[PDB]
């Protein structure tokens, strides 16, 4: 009867709002955060809303194997299974550094270290968390995995014909092939050859991370036909990711992953959604 969810990176932003919506529907939700204080503060806010679903907190840093293992063991002990995983934790890989004359071209700085970390959080963190929780999801009557992506994850944002050839060939997609794409991107980043090798010149790591997350979503969906495993652009949302800029509120944006978490049992899998609408991987 009761259903269980984990949302990664849910002390704030879209993740927080996703926890709220799931708990409002009666789902037992584990809010997670890499920082304990931020996570406990967020839990307190959710407790104040008197939602039907129980809310719990557990620490989680998706880049830390010990942290991931501890979360998995907690879920195993508390629930014995998991029904929903939302892979929401993510970063943009940049740091901030006449009105018509105002030039913003240098305000966002990108470094190799930030690129590497962005890929580690957005992609390897999603993979690590999913791997750890998969045995528990396998015990659900209707498991769901929702990977939060971006419209910038469409293949058309990567000029490289080499990269698109691998990333777009669904029938031959493997985790090892995704590693080859990542490795080459990072090598090219470090060498200073992004333009020459057909990588996006700006928000480079973020875009690559999201294209790869979309491809990873397809791999998973094929391996686990009883699961609903979908990826979703939640929309351009006013969160700290964009330093407060956006068109949607975080609450409005969270509607989109929540719908994918709460699909009917005969619902789709292996698809990309732009907000509420099915969209192309291309
Ligand atoms: N807002 C948008 O316009 C937009 C558009 C498309 C997609 N998205 C995606 O939506 C997701 C949520 O982003 P948001 O807009 O809500 O941004 P946000 O407000 O910056 O929230 C990011 C969340 O991820 C957490 N996080 C970062 N690194 C982590 C790690 N290593 N382990 C665990 N958690 C970590 C953050 O924790 P801390 O508080 O500790 O940093 C925070 O809770 C991301 O995947 C993002 O790519 C957002």
Numbering used by the authors: 7 to 103, 115 to 299
Text from the published report:
SDRs each have a Rossmann fold for NAD(P)+ binding, and the SDR active site is characterized by a conserved catalytic tyrosine residue, which is accompanied by a lysine residue to give the conserved motif YxxxK; frequently a serine or threonine unit serves as an additional active‐site residue to make a catalytic triad. To investigate whether C. roseus harbours an SDR that uses strictosidine aglycone as a substrate, SDR gene candidates that were co‐regulated with known MIA biosynthetic genes were selected for screening in in vitro biochemical assays. The discovery of VAS demonstrates the capacity of an SDR to reduce an additional isomer of strictosidine aglycone to form a new alkaloid backbone. The reduction catalysed by VAS probably works by a standard SDR mechanism, with the C‐4 hydride of NADPH attacking C‐17 of the iminium substrate.
Crystallization of VAS was carried out with and without the oxidized cofactor NADP+. After solution of the structures it was clear that the apo enzyme active site also had a high occupancy of NADP+, thus indicating that VAS is purified from E. coli as a holoenzyme. The two subunits of VAS in the asymmetric unit form a dimeric assembly. Part of the interface involves an extended loop from each subunit (residues 103–124), delineated by β5 and β6 that form a β‐hairpin, although sections of this loop are disordered in both subunits; this is referred to as the “flap domain” in related structures. The two active‐site cavities face each other across the apparent dimer interface, with the two opposing NADP+ C‐4 atoms only ≈17 Å apart, and are framed by the base of the flap domain and another loop that arises between β8 and α9 (residues 251–266) and folds over the cofactor (i.e., the “cofactor loop”). In this arrangement, the active centres are effectively inaccessible to bulk solvent, thus prompting us to speculate that the quaternary structure suggested by the crystal structure is not representative of the active state of the enzyme. In support of this proposal, the elution profiles of VAS in size exclusion chromatography and dynamic light scattering analysis are consistent with a monomeric species with an estimated molecular size of 32 kDa (calculated molecular mass of His6‐VAS is 34 469 Da). The substrate‐binding pocket itself is comparatively constricted, with the C‐4 atom of the nicotinamide ring projecting into it.
